[PDB]
Assembly symmetry: D3
Homo-oligomer: 154 residues x 6
Amino acid sequence: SMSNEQTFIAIKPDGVQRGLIGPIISRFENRGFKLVAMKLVSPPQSQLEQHYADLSDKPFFKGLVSYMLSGPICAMVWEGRDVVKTGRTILGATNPLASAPGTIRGDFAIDVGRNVCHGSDSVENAKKEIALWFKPEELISWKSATFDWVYEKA
Amino acid sequence: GSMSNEQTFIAIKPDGVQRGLIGPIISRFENRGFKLVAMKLVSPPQSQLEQHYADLSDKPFFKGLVSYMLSGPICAMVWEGRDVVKTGRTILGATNPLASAPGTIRGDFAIDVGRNVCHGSDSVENAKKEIALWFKPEELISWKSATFDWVYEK
Amino acid sequence: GSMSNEQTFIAIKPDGVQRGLIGPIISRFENRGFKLVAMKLVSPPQSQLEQHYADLSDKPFFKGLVSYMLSGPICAMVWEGRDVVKTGRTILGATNPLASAPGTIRGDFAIDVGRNVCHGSDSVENAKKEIALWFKPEELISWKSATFDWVYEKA
Amino acid sequence: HHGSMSNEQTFIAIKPDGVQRGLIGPIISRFENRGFKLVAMKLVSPPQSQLEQHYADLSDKPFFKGLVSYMLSGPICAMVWEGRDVVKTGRTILGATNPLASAPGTIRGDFAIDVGRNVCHGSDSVENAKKEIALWFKPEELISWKSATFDWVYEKA
Amino acid sequence: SMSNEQTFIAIKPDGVQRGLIGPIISRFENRGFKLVAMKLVSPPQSQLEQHYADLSDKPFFKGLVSYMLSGPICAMVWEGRDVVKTGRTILGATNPLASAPGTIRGDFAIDVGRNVCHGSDSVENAKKEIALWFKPEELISWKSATFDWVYEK
Amino acid sequence: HGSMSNEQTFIAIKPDGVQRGLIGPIISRFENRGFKLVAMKLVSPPQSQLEQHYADLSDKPFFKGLVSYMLSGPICAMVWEGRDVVKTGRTILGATNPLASAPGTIRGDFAIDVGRNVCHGSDSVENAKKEIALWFKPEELISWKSATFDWVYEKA
């Protein structure tokens, strides 16, 4: 609906390790979405446990957390119309085996446990994830010079 | 698509030109094996755009569609090849970029249907109409690709 | 129980070589995380092409296929990784380019099914057969990717 | 010395070998990405008399007839690009006229080998650009528009 | 000399506006340099005036600072052997008219006042710029899986 | 510059180039320029072959370490054919030490350390002939004619 919808996109440690920071940003940049926040971080274990709190009672929870601590993460907020859903489409199917070539995982990933990136799955979860990963002042307010060539209305 | 000399009309809309997408869009058709047989940068008169959109003259959005397409230059092209009409639309992606797949032009570069960066003829008959409308007959260039027999089974 | 050491046979056909597509096709598999184990430029003898296409020997226009595949060099490759046979086919795209999707090799580069730029094995068992047909065993290079553990969670 | 006027224009042509080898998109992208503005473009198979006029300075050379004949042998993507110093910087983007002397990263240093198959042409001076633009294009084929990012490409007008 | 030399690379507001974040990051990433800090920032005028302290007495100073306030900046620390000098080579000549195609400015820029990016000009100026633009905890310690294939050791 | 369009050179992608996923990009640089691939294989050659490859450097203190390093992974061995391909090939690779190389070349885009400089290219027409014959069996050189030869070359 509105062109100021926001989503959280993270490049996971394997994405950073395999040199995919540049290509992943370009996918979102070229599509017309606006980068409003970005930082390279090695977040503390508590933040990762809170991020994955829905999986806390799962037997893989401990190893998943320790894996996400194993290298830096490129955390980002992207803004645009339907950016949450279209963002997931750009990333491709969560399991790369189900993903389509032309998407990030369909071009770059194989294992679901090494699926290079994450994107919020809903507007509500995006708001939660943005608040968990960013301070409010880390979101930069700006307007793209080509806004009116990307969008027909607000 | 039966005959390898089928032709379609592809236009890069004002937003495609403004956002610097001329090169990338041409490369998509070039790399696929289609042959560019006509091209010009043009800002056509309102009467021509109204005739282009003649099948929509009885739609409420008709005037704003015409007025938007007057708001910047258009890269008008004729591409030739087997099934180029239908395959060309597949290359452009779904008319509404929200329904398009990454790896297509609109799936890589566009968000709003009113800013969907390009147009392609929707049928062989409409292609011939659009080609006759946008190009004089002598602007279609007759030539044979050096790799014709490697693109097409003889 | 798909193991990360599965192998498939990918070949760039004479039209792919002629049209300058060796680099981009290799990049598609390289970027995905699959490991190149074997590769060679080759113009194989007619008898090897006929054995490669054994399933088509009693179908029409068999001679025409073999002649066309003799008409230029082929870039023969072995790629290794988890589910590489099935995923490799998805990367190539639908065998008939008219049915393929942009973002695949054929959806980006090809038009005619008879000039569809590349080949990939259609099954694990046929890949093993094709790998043994096109490569001597010493031509398969055993190595370990520096990013193996960033591509794979398990073996 | 570089030009200082943002409305300078140059004539860029993709030659029949550049069209034949599938380099239209890549070549346009080099100028597009640099920030130059496309103000005219057409695919054209010009008459022999126009090519002879384009190469008028070489009319007495022994290779003239074969050069003209070669430039007739396939389509040409004719362009006018506009921007600050676009004549001289455009030639820098094309690379040395002889590709053997060109640098990788330029069009000829990425795509060409023989000077007689050097994929493209660019005007060699501001005055020759003005002449070439008028030779290859009708005046109404130059398109007036304003790039949305003009003020992020240029500090001054 | 040392493979842990660091330099400050900034994508200026024009580079952000023109959609060049991805390509610029890719140039450094593909070369083998390691990203150790990155943030998108709209830094305060005080920080920009410090960054340009040496030009404070120039006529263009006020407009220069105002321009660098006009859009976000992608601020980065890159690490690797000779990354300061080699980083400047990757960016191209500071004036894009003097830059070579194949560099960032030679591929994407025309005006020196709209030259898309900045890179430290010396190791000592890099240490100064990193301290000014980054907090120390924003620099992340990690080791590339391909370190031993980029570097002999 | 050479003037014979059938000149050949030996180009190798070193173990670090293979490890870092640069096979595709490096081949494309030569492919896009108009050079013709006439031989290619992935190989892990024996020490004796590498010592013969580097015979002109066998009096240098880095010789044994250079040989050992070239055994540390697979090598993509290639022969490319075209006018001035030896000298223009080296120009495409960039300066041997990437510190001195220019962006837009292979080493200027992808490499930092001279000991991890991604690739090798023959330094002379004669050394190309020797290297080609050292790395390939005679029958691994493939005879074919590029469909765009007459659009890459004006004559000869």
